[PDB]
Amino acid sequence: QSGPYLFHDEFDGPAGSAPDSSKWTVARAREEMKDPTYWERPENVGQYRDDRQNVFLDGKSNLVIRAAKDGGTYYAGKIQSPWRGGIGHTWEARIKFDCLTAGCWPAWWLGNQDRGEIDIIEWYGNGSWPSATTVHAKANGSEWKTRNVALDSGWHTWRCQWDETGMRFWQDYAEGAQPYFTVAAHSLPDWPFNDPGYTVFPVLNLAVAGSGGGDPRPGSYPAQMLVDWVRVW
Numbered sequence: 001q002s003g004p005y006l007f008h009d010e011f012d013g014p015a016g017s018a019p020d021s022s023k024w025t026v027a028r029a030r031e032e033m034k035d036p037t038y039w040e041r042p043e044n045v046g047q048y049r050d051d052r053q054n055v056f057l058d059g060k061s062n063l064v065i066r067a068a069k070d071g072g073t074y075y076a077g078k079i080q081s082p083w084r085g086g087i088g089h090t091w092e093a094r095i096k097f098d099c100l101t102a103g104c105w106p107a108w109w110l111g112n113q114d115r116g117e118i119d120i121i122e123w124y125g126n127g128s129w130p131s132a133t134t135v136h137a138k139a140n141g142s143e144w145k146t147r148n149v150a151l152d153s154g155w156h157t158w159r160c161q162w163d164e165t166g167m168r169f170w171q172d173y174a175e176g177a178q179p180y181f182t183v184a185a186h187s188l189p190d191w192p193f194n195d196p197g198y199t200v201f202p203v204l205n206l207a208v209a210g211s212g213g214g215d216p217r218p219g220s221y222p223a224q225m226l227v228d229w230v231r232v233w
């Protein structure tokens with residue numbers, strides 16, 4: 001866990017800095033949702049923009065993703081690395097969720113363009129869905145293994161070891177610790193992760209509204225997610 005790293009960002013630099021553009025691309029728009037339900041409609045959904053008001057470094061070694069209303073619209077943020085990694089590595093981020101409020105939908109996850117998703121941790125502000133770690137096999141998202149995870153606003157590390165045997169997850173890993181969830185390889189239909197050449201990219205985001213965020217009006221904004229580092233080894 002001390003490296004050397006295949007990929008890392010320590011998010012160091014002065015307050016108000018952009019994240020390192022050699023490691024991240026900042027989202028400029030929320031993913032459009034076909035046949036939107038109420039909180040997914042264009043007029044209700046939270047947006048993403050590359051604006052230092054929403055995605056910036058705090059000068060204390062953290063990425064800040066900040067959700068806030070600006071002229072009738074909630075804006076927040078997402079960063080995704082162009083860097084992709086294959087099977088057989090460990091992926092970890094140190095995160096503080098100061099955004100566990102109605103409407104928010106933060107996540108730390110590993111993505112793929114075509115099939116498969118590893119949601120290392122995610123919280124739902126909609127008032128209905130439980131915070132959880134989830135592995136998805138199908139693009140529809142509709143085949144998954146999930147485990148609910150109790151979340152607070154403290155600092156924690158969130159680790160996924162993704163190797164040929166599957167995925168193992170830890171919160172606040174320390175020597176000898178037991179994963180809180182394990183997903184066996186080949187345990188979902190058309191499991192994609194063991195395919196030769198399959199890769200994932202790291203993503204950090206704080207969304208507002210949409211399906212998972214729901215109504216932000218009961219929430220308290222601005223709200224933030226802090227990330228001290230992402231490390232892959």
Ligand SMILES: [Mg+2]
Pocket residue numbers: 084085086087
């Ligand atoms: Mg690789």
Ligand SMILES: [Mg+2]
Pocket residue numbers: 009010011012060061062227228229
């Ligand atoms: Mg840091």
